[PDB]
Design a protein around this ligand. Sequence first.
Ligand SMILES: COc1cccc(OC)c1-c1cnnc(NCc2nc3cc(OCC(=O)O)ccc3s2)n1
Ligand SMILES: COc1cccc(OC)c1-c1cnnc(NCc2nc3cc(OCC(=O)O)ccc3s2)n1
Ligand SMILES: [K+]
Ligand SMILES: [K+]
Lengths: 299, 299
Amino acid sequence: VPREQLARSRVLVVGDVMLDRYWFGNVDRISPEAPVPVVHVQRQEERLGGAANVARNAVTLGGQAGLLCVVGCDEPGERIVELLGSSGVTPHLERDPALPTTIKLRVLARQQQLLRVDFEAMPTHEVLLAGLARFDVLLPQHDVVLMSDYAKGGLTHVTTMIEKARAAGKAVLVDPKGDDWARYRGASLITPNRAELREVVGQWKSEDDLRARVANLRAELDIDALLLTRSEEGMTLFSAGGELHAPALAVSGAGDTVIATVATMLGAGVPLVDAVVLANRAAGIVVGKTATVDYDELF
Amino acid sequence: VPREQLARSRVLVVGDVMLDRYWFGNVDRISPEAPVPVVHVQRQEERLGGAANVARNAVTLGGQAGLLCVVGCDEPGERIVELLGSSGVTPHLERDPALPTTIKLRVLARQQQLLRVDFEAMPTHEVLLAGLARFDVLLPQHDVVLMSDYAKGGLTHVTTMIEKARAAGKAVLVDPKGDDWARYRGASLITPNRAELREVVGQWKSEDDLRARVANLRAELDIDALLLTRSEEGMTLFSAGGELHAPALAVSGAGDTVIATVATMLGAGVPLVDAVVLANRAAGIVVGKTATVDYDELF
Ligand SMILES: COc1cccc(OC)c1-c1cnnc(NCc2nc3cc(OCC(=O)O)ccc3s2)n1
Ligand SMILES: COc1cccc(OC)c1-c1cnnc(NCc2nc3cc(OCC(=O)O)ccc3s2)n1
Ligand SMILES: [K+]
Ligand SMILES: [K+]
């Protein structure tokens, strides 16, 4: 794929944005107030998480990406904005002064976690409808929409967003979250892993059992295709015209990398099966480094 | 004491400033990455700590207070500045862009601590000498100096500061920290508790044993008086002209309250024994509420 063909590939990433933050410290003593460790923090690292990382991958492959999401009026909010600007992602953020920007803080010492700390809230109804209005404006400016769900509240109106995108002839990719997929109704492609697929469809016993177990799930959800990631076993694309398997070639943030690759490819006008094939090579690489596959490495 | 007599009582608080911060959250699940709790934080509280709280008490009694200390060029730095301005304390901060502002973060859930997190560093030699220069300028503008030690690095040059203050006929009060008190040499009054006194002087068996155990410690440190706080047993002022005991009348931040009261009183020109007496009443109150005794309650 010419780097100028996918240069005009426009992907609109929509969903839950967050900041993955880490504190590394030393624990030498116990607190005088409680029977708990004391962590003298020596350094802090951070990277874009959630939908933000998904959008990060579309750019490094040579394409363009936009991020429709909600942040708060706080420090991590400012930080995401800065981190977005320095990664090539066009930001389309709604600000909720009452919302804390989603952040997952890990506290570590001796290369071991002691605690995880979350900051998160449900966006106000007012804010969500504002974003939905932005989606209307942003839709025509893009070739494919990517729904990155993390159950934080950003994809409350995903069903509506999907039906608007499909009505404009734009593909809708969904990175799932949870056991309720009724909201993903009408989506072009949905990309769960083996664990994620179960809780919706249950456990199975043969690729012929899994085969039909996927067929009806696609049939009752107006979902045209399902891309099942299987780690060691590779991927399987269940498209109603057939199936396509792709083995590995060699771990974190790989799910973000595969759906971003498929999205940016489709936007570049490359066929689905080819897009899925490329998503496998991109997958085989980021597991060898979070990471973002460049244009030079993929081809 | 007329509220206009102590209105012109000027206390220069010097030492380690910090921010006491608290996170209250809910813990419902275990992290997918580690066998550690996940704390969804719902609210945050904070108050001035260290030397800052000591300076806070001098103002609420009607007097004036100044704070010579070191903060960093960060968020908690800004926060202390704001918290100082809204408490009546004249700030005299040195900024160290390489230093993290000292903060003690408690994470809690279900009214129970899970972890404490510290941010702290040693001030650069350059910064410490800058502050010492400020002390020279600030000394004449005050009636009494208060050394609030927390072993964070702010009182590296305390011995010099003490000998300069005493040379100008200004009292020097010391709130101790640790087993090395050789640095407090030349101080007017030093205010440890029973636990703090031991590690320097060891354990004792009779007020006559403790009596002489204090006498020599005062004699080898050019320290004129020691105010021993004994909780339930009250206080004892060991001044070489005699002793003075003051029983309780009825818990946290009480040590800050007693030494602040003594300091602000001496600055108002009230005698030592009277100042110590008043420090007992101030003590008997804050244990009934951190807290700051007002002028209306003390008298
Ligand atoms: C995250 O991927 C792996 C993880 C473990 C072992 C692996 O194979 C040696 C892989 C791997 C490496 N390269 N290709 C493949 N095959 C296709 C893929 N399987 C997965 C599975 C993924 O997530 C697994 C999960 O969510 O548990 C994410 C991306 C891919 S891409 N799998
Ligand atoms: C912090 O004070 C108390 C703590 C526990 C019981 C108490 O008596 C009922 C007291 C208390 C209350 N009111 N007056 C007094 N007596 C004089 C004082 N003892 C202490 C002891 C202090 O700290 C004790 C420590 O550091 O462990 C701080 C201030 C005073 S003031 N003690
Ligand atoms: K990686
Ligand atoms: K109190």
